[PDB]
Design a binder for this molecule. Structure first.
Ligand SMILES: Nc1nc2c(ncn2[C@@H]2O[C@H](COP(=O)(O)OP(=O)(O)OP(=O)(O)O)[C@@H](O)[C@H]2O)c(=O)[nH]1
Ligand SMILES: O=C([O-])C(=O)[O-]
Ligand SMILES: [Mn+2]
Ligand SMILES: [Mn+2]
Ligand code: NA
Ligand code: NA
Length: 608
C-alpha cells in the first residue's frame, strides 16, 4: 500500500498467523468498522477469566457469589429477545427465500432485496466500532474436525458475545489450526454503539434498538448483525448459522439442519437408541433432552438440546451431530421438578442473562419452585427490589442460562463423536390444549412430513411447522420437498416419526398429563414401536398405543379417555384449518405429496 494494514492495533495474536482469507475478512472489516484494538481470541481459560473480570470491573456483568464462577448480565430491556421483524434473508428473488402469501404477509420468513440491504448496511457499519475492541472469534459448529462440522469466524465488539461463544461453540486457536485455508462462514456483529456514545447507555448494555438488523446472505456465505447484543441476534453460530444458513446448505448438499434436541435412551435391557425431537421454542425441548426418567431401569442422556445436523451415512443411517458446545436454555420454569439435570449443570461456569439475583448471590426466576430462607431478598432482572406479590416477574420470561455441555451430568457419551449418532425416531410436538392425543405414530414418511408441517405452538393457535417458523433459510415449500426427497434416497433407513402432545387440557384448563420425567412412559412406547412391537392401534390420525400398552403405574389418576380421545368434529376442523393455512402461506410451492396427505387425512376423518 501507498500509506489497510491493521497490525499496529493487534493486542492479542497476530494477523500474520491467520489463514490468508481470515486475515482479509478481519482487515476489510477493521477498515470498515474502525475498531481501536483487534483481539484474536485463543479460547484459553486465561483469556476467558480476564474478559469476565474486565466486564465485571466495567459493571457489564456481576459475579454470583453463591456459585462457582457464575455470572449475571442484565440487559437494556429493549434488547431481550430475537426480533423476527428485523431478521432477514437476502436473495436475488424473494420466492427463493419465502413463499408468496395470499394475505400479503409471510409467517415463514422475511426477505430483503440486495439493494435494500446494501443501503441498510452502509447506514450502520461504517465506523460502528470506534473506540472499541474488535474480537476475532474462530469457532467450530460441531466437534472440531468432524466431517459434519462447519467453521465460522465471528467479528464482534462485544466481550459478552466472546464469553458466550466460548461456551456455546468450540472456539480459539485450535479452530484456526483446523481451518487452515478452508472455507468458513463470515459472521460480522456490532452492538452499533461507536464511542463517543451518541445516546445514553442503559444498564451498562450497549445496543441500538432502532437500527437492529440481523441479516443472512446465503449466496455470499455471510451473516451480518447490527444493534443487538442479545442471544440469537449476537451469538451468530446458533440460529443464524446453524439453522438459517445451514438449512440452505443442507438443502443444496442433501442433509438436514433442524431445531431439534437429540437424546439417547437406554431401556432396562441395556439397549440404546437415539431420538431427535422438534418442538417449537417454549414447548420443552430442553426438559426432554435432559429428562430424568421416572420409569425404573430407563436412562436418558443428552446429545444436544436445540439444534441437530443430520446426514445419511454410507450404510443409510441418519447420523446426527449437535453443532453446539453448550446449552443456551430458558431459565424461568427450570426447577428440580421440571429439569433436575439442568439445575445440576448450571451451578458452575455458567452465564445467566436477565434473571433475578438473591441477596446471598444466587439466582431466581418464576417457576424455580425453591423457597428462600426468611430474610433472603430478591433483586429483579430490572435491578429493583422485588417481592413475590408484585405485578411483574422477577426474571424476564425469555431469560437464559448459558452453560457448558460437557458439565451436564447426563451428557451422552457420544455427544462429540465426529460421525454423529444414528437417529431411529423423529418426534414432532407442540402445544395443543384440545383434540390431539398424548402420542401418535405417522403412517409413512410422507404422512410424517405432513405431521411435522402441521405442528403448533402458543396454545394451539400459531402454526410452527417443524419448529422452524422463525428459522427457515429458504422457501418453506421447498424445504417440505427436501424432506420428502429423503424417502427416495436408496437404502436410507428412514426414522419412525411420532407426534407428541404434553399440553392437552380438560374443560377447566387442567393438564391431563403430568409430563416432565413421566414422559419416559411415552418414550418407552416409541422405543418398543421402533423394535417392531405389536403395541399400536390404527386410528384415522395414525397409530396410537393399545389399551394397556403405556405403563401408567404410579399414575392412576390419569383420565385416559380424554387424554387419548379422537373426535371427528375436532379433526374436521383441524383439516380445514390446515388446508386454509397451507393455501394462504405456501400455495404454489406446496408439494403434491403434502396435498395428498391432507386429502388422505380428510378422507379417513370422513369415515368416522
Ligand atoms: N405441561 C408440561 N409442560 C412442559 C413439559 N415440558 C416442558 N414444558 C414447559 O415448556 C416450557 C419450557 O420450555 P423451553 O425451555 O421454553 O422450550 P425449548 O423447546 O427448550 O425452547 P428454546 O430453548 O427457546 O428452543 C415451560 O413452560 C415448561 O413448563 C411437560 O412435559 N409438560
Ligand atoms: O434461543 C432459542 O433456543 C430459541 O429461541 O429457539
Ligand atoms: Mn431450550
Ligand atoms: Mn431454540
Ligand atoms: Na447490565
Ligand atoms: Na415421493
Amino acid at each position: 500500500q501507498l500509506h489497510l494494514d491493521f497490525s499496529a492495533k493487534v493486542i492479542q495474536g497476530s494477523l500474520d498467523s491467520l489463514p490468508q482469507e481470515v486475515r482479509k475478512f478481519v482487515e476489510g472489516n477493521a477498515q470498515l468498522c474502525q475498531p481501536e484494538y483487534i483481539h484474536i481470541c485463543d479460547g484459553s481459560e486465561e483469556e476467558y477469566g480476564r474478559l469476565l473480570a474486565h466486564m465485571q470491573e466495567e459493571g457489564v456483568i456481576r459475579k454470583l457469589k453463591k456459585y462457582d464462577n457464575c455470572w449475571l448480565a442484565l440487559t437494556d430491556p429493549r434488547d431481550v429477545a430475537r426480533i423476527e421483524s428485523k431478521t432477514v434473508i437476502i436473495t436475488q428473488e424473494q420466492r427463493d427465500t419465502v413463499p408468496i402469501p395470499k394475505s400479503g404477509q409471510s409467517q415463514l420468513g422475511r426477505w430483503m432485496s440486495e439493494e435494500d440491504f446494501e443501503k441498510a448496511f452502509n447506514a450502520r457499519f461504517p465506523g460502528c466500532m470506534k473506540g472499541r475492541t474488535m474480537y476475532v472469534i474462530p469457532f467450530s459448529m460441531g466437534p472440531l474436525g468432524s466431517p459434519l462440522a462447519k467453521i465460522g469466524i465471528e467479528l464482534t465488539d462485544s466481550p459478552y458475545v466472546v464469553a458466550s461463544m466460548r461456551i456455546m461453540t468450540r472456539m480459539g486457536t485450535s479452530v484456526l489450526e483446523a481451518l487452515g485455508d478452508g472455507e468458513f462462514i463470515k459472521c460480522l456483529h456490532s452492538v452499533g454503539c461507536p464511542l463517543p456514545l451518541k445516546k445514553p447507555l442503559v444498564n451498562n448494555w450497549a445496543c441500538n434498538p432502532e437500527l437492529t438488523l440481523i441479516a443472512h446472505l446465503p449466496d455470499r456465505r455471510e451473516i451480518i448483525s447490527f444493534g443487538s447484543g442479545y442471544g440469537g441476534n449476537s451469538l451468530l453460530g446458533k440460529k443464524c448459522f446453524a439453522l438459517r444458513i445451514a438449512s440452505r446448505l443442507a438443502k443444496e448438499e442433501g442433509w438436514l439442519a433442524e431445531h431439534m434436541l437429540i437424546l439417547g435412551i437406554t431401556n432396562p435391557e441395556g439397549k440404546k437408541k437415539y431420538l431427535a425431537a422438534a418442538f417449537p421454542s417454549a414447548c420443552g425441548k430442553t426438559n426432554l433432552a435432559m429428562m430424568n426418567p421416572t420409569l425404573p431401569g430407563w436412562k436418558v442422556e443428552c446429545v444436544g438440546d436445540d439444534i441437530a445436523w443430520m446426514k445419511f451415512d454410507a450404510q443409510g443411517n441418519l447420523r446426527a451431530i449437535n453443532p453446539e458446545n453448550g446449552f443456551f436454555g430458558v431459565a424461568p420454569g427450570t426447577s428440580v421438578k421440571t429439569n433436575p439435570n439442568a439445575i445440576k449443570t448450571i451451578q458452575k461456569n455458567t452465564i445467566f442473562t436477565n434473571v433475578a439475583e438473591t441477596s446471598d448471590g444466587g439466582v431466581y426466576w418464576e417457576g424455580i419452585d425453591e423457597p428462600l430462607a426468611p430474610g433472603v431478598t430478591i433483586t429483579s432482572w430490572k435491578n429493583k427490589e422485588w417481592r413475590p406479590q408484585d405485578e411483574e416477574p422477577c426474571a424476564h420470561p425469555n431469560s437464559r442460562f448459558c452453560t457448558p455441555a460437557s458439565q451436564c451430568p447426563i451428557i451422552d457419551p457420544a455427544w462429540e463423536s465426529p460421525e454423529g449418532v444414528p437417529i431411529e425416531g423423529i418426534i414432532f410436538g407442540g402445544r395443543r390444549p384440545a383434540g390431539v392425543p398424548l402420542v401418535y405414530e405417522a403412517l409413512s414418511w410422507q404422512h410424517g412430513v405432513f405431521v411435522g408441517a402441521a405442528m403448533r405452538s402458543e396454545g394451539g393457535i400459531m402454526h410452527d411447522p417443524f419448529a422452524m417458523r422463525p428459522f427457515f433459510g429458504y422457501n418453506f415449500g421447498k424445504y417440505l420437498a427436501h424432506w420428502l426427497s429423503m424417502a427416495h434416497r436408496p437404502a436410507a433407513k428412514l426414522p419412525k416419526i411420532f407426534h407428541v402432545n404434553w399440553f392437552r387440557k380438560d374443560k377447566n384448563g387442567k393438564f391431563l398429563w403430568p409430563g416432565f420425567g413421566e414422559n419416559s412412559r411415552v418414550l418407552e412406547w416409541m422405543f418398543g414401536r421402533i423394535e417392531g412391537e405389536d403395541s399400536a392401534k390404527l386410528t384415522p390420525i395414525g397409530y396410537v398405543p393399545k389399551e394397556d400398552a403405556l405403563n401408567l403405574k404410579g399414575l392412576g389418576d390419569v383420565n385416559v379417555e380424554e387424554l387419548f380421545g379422537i373426535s371427528k368434529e375436532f379433526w374436521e376442523k383441524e383439516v380445514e384449518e390446515i388446508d386454509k393455512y397451507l393455501e394462504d402461506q405456501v400455495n404454489a410451492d406446496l408439494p403434491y405429496e403434502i396435498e395428498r396427505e391432507l386429502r388422505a387425512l380428510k378422507q379417513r376423518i370422513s369415515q368416522m
